[model samples]
Target: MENFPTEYFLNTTVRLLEYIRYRDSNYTREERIENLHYAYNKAAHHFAQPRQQQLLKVDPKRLQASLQTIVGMVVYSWAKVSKECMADLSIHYTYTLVLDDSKDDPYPTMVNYFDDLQAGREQAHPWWALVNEHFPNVLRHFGPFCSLNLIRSTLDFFEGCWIEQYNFGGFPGSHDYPQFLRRMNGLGHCVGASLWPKEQFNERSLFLEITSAIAQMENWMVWVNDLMSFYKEFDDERDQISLVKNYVVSDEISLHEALEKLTQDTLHSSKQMVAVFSDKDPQVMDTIECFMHGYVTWHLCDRKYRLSEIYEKVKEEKTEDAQKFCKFYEQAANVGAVSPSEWAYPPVAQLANV
Candidate 1:
């Protein structure tokens, strides 16, 4: 607090703001965004306090303002599109909920992922029935926002590309709901969601390369958090034999647990890593890690940016359905560009143990 260089904190503050504005849309309210800002500021204060004697000098006020401004702009942009998508999809899920738990399937958690709306409708939309039988008014009250196809698509990419690509990124069980949300909202993929034409973002950056590094660093942090969370899960499993077996844990602690913890500790080895340009909470390392990634991804690879890149990438991949992919992506964007955040919906995919 007293000894930390004011300049160091200022640098962190500027980065924090950049992160927020990156995640949100320019249209969103300023005060309502920047999920990681407050935490990082505290961490700056904490680090400053312990090392005052061995201090570096910097201006705290200037640092705070710079960080806040950048992140705020980013978050605002993300929110504008996200809110609209959320509203449309919320309504769609209200009365058409369906569950398709097939062989070895974790669960049918996608929100109309297949657009299997007809098949589910033929099945009477079992999820809708369950909701009606158990909690009817929910859909009735919240059904007006169900057309978030872009959001749904984004969520699908998260499952297929990120969560499914790795283990313990989401929760092992349904209990780790928040972690799932964090992952969904995290940077790497959500930003990638922009690749889909259905939800293109307004391009604000001069060069995407500059922001790409931010995305890489944020993903690195997220990977650390994922490993740490996985490690914690392993520790919990050690106490219960049946659960341990279910989780495939072995030995006194389990390799998974040890590896993840080591990664978490190693990831945050320096204050420079903690340099948030906005109002971020450094204490919520996991949350900050997730937020930063999400912010960078959203701003850099927003729908507008992604749509263009996807067209080129698919062509390069030399897939037969390049035209088809472009059509779907473009059609979706043409109809409406869902918010970047909306891409990660169907709370169930975000549920644990799935």
Candidate 2:
């Protein structure tokens, strides 16, 4: 934002696309996927050769669920987002997930496709069509400066994904985990830049401070995700680097012990952020608060994270330090912004009942 033009919007066409992708206006997930299937089939026929069809499989529910969680966080924070902006964000998110799913796909695994994209061989990847199609819209709405920054940030994000994918570098130390997570999840800057007022975007000094606060919030956010995702990642046998795993490996601690330590660390981390941003710029602070609160609440309620049942089960299963930590974890989870219920669609109440 400091270096880029500070403005954005979603055109009517993209707004309709958002409605289709996110099941807005009573649309169902199946309907969303069906729309995507039709669109991608035509896109492949028109913009791609026979080989591209293989990569164009439309898993709309999976893609939409994942994108909505992030988009929901942003919109829940600020109450609105350009459909076009989310389209750009979703492409980056889905690309990373595709790379993560290399085991299922045959030709041009995540690494291969990513390398092709990086090396300027756009014709070979399905994602290239998306980039070509969506980026121009992004540039038109958000301007070249914000658009290029988004591209740059996404490239860095994907590289970080690649690094973590292969363990190209070893895990960070406990002291460095927050910093490392910040770099990996730094797209918050681009999202924040787009959503906040243009004047806020131009203040580098204030922006840096706000970014630090946001990064701190992300630190705990990812920690909670890793803490909650332990069972699923383990069951999937995915080589996900996690705080609990890192602790178990590096500190020679048991899983329960690692969870306890990390839970306590999460509480402390959340407290640090509250203190840091509590007296800072009200607008930025409010945005960060909304994002963090909505993020935690989303995780708490969303079935995909599988948090509630597992969380309760973990609490019931534990009797020692783990039990104590679960109590502390609840406290940590409660430490977020006031109700973001209004920003949520279908209301979070309906979301939980689902």
Candidate 3:
């Protein structure tokens, strides 16, 4: 290998430190803590639609805990968007994960989705209905192409999740299939599209750079999650449907080698993003860098990854300010800021089919 044994990258703490070091030069620990709290409260603000309440009925507190889990990623990833846009994206992903983990008889609504949209009928499943209402608000912040990539990537997430769900005990041997599936579920393109809000990123003028960013994100998104989540998922048999696990079996490599492989790939992806954007607009550079930094920070700080066992400083203490922020709500930040009029549906919403 390059300079050290595979064990060098295999150490969870070593890999964690590698990613944690990639911080936003300006967004410090104090600001990150405050921003995370602010973002959590925004997601926690209970708009409580019938669809949301209906879905939450299955596992009410899942949304509560998951919201806190995603705050670091949301606050850091889109670290440059307007408050309105940031709040919308925060709630969007929070709900997205809830739907991801729950089954809730979503097939009926999924089957009827395209035709239902065609006939101006409501989606049967709460998740579909809820996303229908909220996703357009996010789309308004982008032009046609950027929105297209977002919608397409999101649909890919749906399809990939369905495929991965169906892909149980045994998986295909082809190494590429793992990534083909993960790319859809990872939501990298969704993050890429969200990075370019209408006020900031003009799609037509910077189409090439935006396209490259989206392509790079497909790998950056999932591989980074794989590397960070290794510690948490390392022993859980249920979470074994992962890249490193699959790579070990499908590629005939040892567990340490598979882990090292992903660590290298994730590092390479982060580097490639900088190489592509460093010379472009300062705005682009800042957004991508902050996103990577915030994303890594989230993995380090969030209790879910079990990273606190290794990095003591990453464990955030409970603060009065954090509690105060959590207890407050803002209609402007959460629901009232954007109306249905601004959230125009994509031109080809009905084209998503197998």
Candidate 4:
């Protein structure tokens, strides 16, 4: 086995980012990046201030960074979405980050999450409480199939976290369990399903193409995440698990081999994404291409990932007082300035009383 240092991984990632941007996303790369700050600021404005920190118990800066990533992701990936949809996606993504980061939460209220929700009870943890409040709000912008995908994908993510709690406890990996867990835990499907809102992409006429894009998107997003997150997650002394760690253990290979294997899969999926959508529909192709470009841009620019050799802190917050999302329904219905035709499934009034 060849011994490689952190520098090797850093250099490899930089080159990959350059290659992907140049080859796959040159047309709109600069345009999307220029919008990064506005996107991040917009996301920051919607976050319910004062109480978010008290409730989630996350480091203020880290929480800000995570939400910025979500904002940049949607801004770049689905540029045509309404402000309300973008905020909903950011809030929902933050919910996952809070839960995932809590591998060390003081108590485990999540175990009874589904049961509690099923029984019409409030969640014990503030994180889960917020999730229960806002998650469904994310669905109004999406059609039925896309909405179902979001629900199923989120449930899959929660289940994956539950199984992983034990998997991290000195469990040995083998067979396809690593990829299997990656699939379940990724939330790639949710991101994919989100690119097309009912009004903009119109899922009814493009069901086959939309679903295919979604299938391609999961791998594209999740694998690229693993690839980029490698540097940050590698140094943690705890059994910080990731796709690469799992792959190395499962395949009985060196760290180098695992990284290379994942890189191949990541690029392959990215190219496959282009091949799958190249000639489909102008709107569909354009949305995906923008997302791929912006998604990579988020990983490269965000400090939360700790890819510091290329460090550029683009998060700026000036606070917007237009409307706050103190409630879940408000986040979905907080459309700042858009006509009725912009959102096919306008914010449902049913959310108000719930």
Candidate 5:
């Protein structure tokens, strides 16, 4: 801290403070909304019209509503990413939805790649092509060493995708939950590690420790996502591999009981992360808190997660299970519904140690 130029530290501090303020303030609600719109249009423009038509056949409305800005904010908070990096990530994260909906009949295989096989072509959809083009450039911007870890992190996400595809029809046992979550949300740690330039010892061990902590944070995040979307996804009947499903069927518990366990475990993962890092690593601690606050706030407020549309869709399901699940579904929705509030910023004294 003493060696860096005074102006640089001051500028960095201001940016971090502004990020905190933005999270806490209600007046700036429009910024997140505008970011959602920006990310969609930016990704959409990269596709040819033909590609757009083919890609959008999956689900245009859900695609538009999906928000990946929470992960983008983690990058911004940790790395102070440039506008270019932000745009690249927005495109990259938006493509996760493409991958989700693009699954074929076998469940894990992507429809676009199958199209390639049938046509004897090597072409990708516009979103996939754009992700391919921008991924390398984004890593390059971070330098070679960071690039190495970033690539590893990305491969973790790809592995998770494969596992998800492989497990499409079956529910994972309780023992498999940890591995399932690590693969699913490891990309968040990957991106966070790429932006984390402060290596105290230049030791691989320290780097691994911080990233492991971040992975736990990511687990907390994705579990919350699964809990919030359970009814919608369950009713849709495409995502039986989710945490909620695993818990519900594995223990023979009610949907409401599963959600209760999910919420408790989600908070436990977050608290465990803080306990592990809060005293030893303030920067990592601060960043994890930001991720926690930002993601929950996004889930609480994002129109994409709102329950009215899902309730309308689910209540129409003719199955006995659907009728029984709706009661628990409404309970779950009410549990998450809330007004966003100002999160108390960590004290300056604690941050100064970093």
Candidate 6:
């Protein structure tokens, strides 16, 4: 495992991502947009002034539902896999997202958590319960799972993913930043972009492998998030989003350099900033590592390069692909990093097992 071939891992990772998109193609664009939005909001909201924050607080529940909008987005991206499965499961999760917040103040709380879940279960009906609930088969719905937990973790691993770039919401070093440094801590994606412009490689002259790594990281992060939040999210669908959506497929970006001025944030889009907020949960940490090595790394090594054929040319000697990918993630999205983790236990393996 330690000395795996580079191309083999790359290909394997690509296949897993392709499988996700293949099964959940209905919401492809939305998934990409929401992911970008989450990152963007994380960045823009911080410096966006009070007016923007007010809009951002419209309804954590509604905002949560909007985040699930990625379901429809991913559904439209991938062409393979059964749309029936994607749509069926999507309806359940989407319904859960909306219905979960119908009562109460439409926000997060302990009591509502269980209430929303009970409602989700009541709403599960026959359709969702039937569309492939088995292990790998459930992987088809990774998009929804991620959408649900984009912010549901007791241990926020996204923070640690970008440990190096700790200015906005990263680790405080000589500079001495607070734990929540940015104006909007959740909106660090924008700050992440400012700190690292490598992730924003959607330009004409960008290298293919770099872009591949970026896409793979995005898919892997979403997938990893879904797995991490399996217990709490699925515990009550009414209160959570499912991570099932189209996650892979090659698309060529044609942003004109003249039109796309190179701002610090925009230039750093190639990297991912992972903000980790741990609750001293060893199980979650272990799960994070499992996903990183087994699930996340698998996808990174394999599909991280499917964005273009040029990735095929990169050799295995590049050991820093993972770190390099994180450095430029902020620019790719609007304002966030790809959170990293060192969980207490390996939930990914257990979740993947079930």
Which lDDT tens digits does candidate 3 get at residues 229-308? 77677668577577777787676777778877887787777667777888898877777777776666566556677654
Candidate with more favorable, higher lDDT: 5 or 6: 5
Off by over 4 Å in 5: 1-41, 47-62, 67-81, 105-130, 141-146, 159-174, 177-182, 185-188, 191-209, 231-239, 250-257, 280-282, 307-354
What are the per-residue Cα lDDT tens digits for candidate 4 across 272-320? Answer: 7777788899988888776776566556555556553322211121222
**How do the candidates rank by lDDT, highest first?**
4, 3, 5, 2, 1, 6
**Candidate 3 — number of clashing residue pairs?**
0
Among all candidates shown, the one with the greatest TM-score: 3
- The per-candidate count of clashes, in order, stands at 88, 0, 0, 1, 0, 106
lDDT of 2 by residue, 1-354 (tens): 122110110121122122212211222334333333333232223322333234545453444444345443333333323333444444444444544443333335444676666776664445555554445544454434445555666666655555555543234345455336435744544454444433334334465764575446545556545655554555554454555565665556666666567656655666676677778878666656655544444455455565444446556654454454355446434432223232223332233233
Q: How many clashing residue pairs, candidate 2?
A: 0
Kindly give the stretch of ten consecutive residues in candidate 4 with the minimal lDDT sum. 320-329
Q: After superposition, how far is residue 107 of candidate 6 from its true place, in Å?
A: 8.5
Report lDDT per candidate: 0.32, 0.46, 0.63, 0.64, 0.48, 0.28
lDDT of 6 at 194: 15
- The C-alpha RMSD in Å for every predicted model, in order, reads 21.7, 13.4, 10.3, 11.3, 15.2, 21.2
- Which structure is stronger by lDDT: 2 or 3? 3
**Model 4 root-mean-square deviation:** 11.3
- Over 1-354, each residue of candidate 5 has an lDDT whose tens digit, in order, gives 113122322232223223323234221334433343344344445432344445444454444333233333332233333444545565566555455554444233355675874675644544444455457656645544555666666656655666676554234355556446545644755655544443332325456655575556556556656655653565554455666656666556766666666666655665576677667656556655655555544443445555455446547676544454454444323432332221111221223233
Query: Over 4 Å off in model 1, which ranges?
Result: 1-82, 85-187, 191-201, 204-218, 227-232, 238-290, 293-354
Q: In candidate 3, which residue pairs clash? A: none
| Positional deviation of residue 122's Cα in model 6 after best superposition, in angstroms | 8.9
lDDT, residue 79, candidate 5: 31
Comparison by lDDT, 1 against 4, better one: 4
- Per-model TM values vs. the true structure: 0.27, 0.56, 0.78, 0.74, 0.58, 0.22
How well does candidate 4 match the true structure in TM-score terms?
0.74
Alpha-carbon lDDT of model 2: 0.46
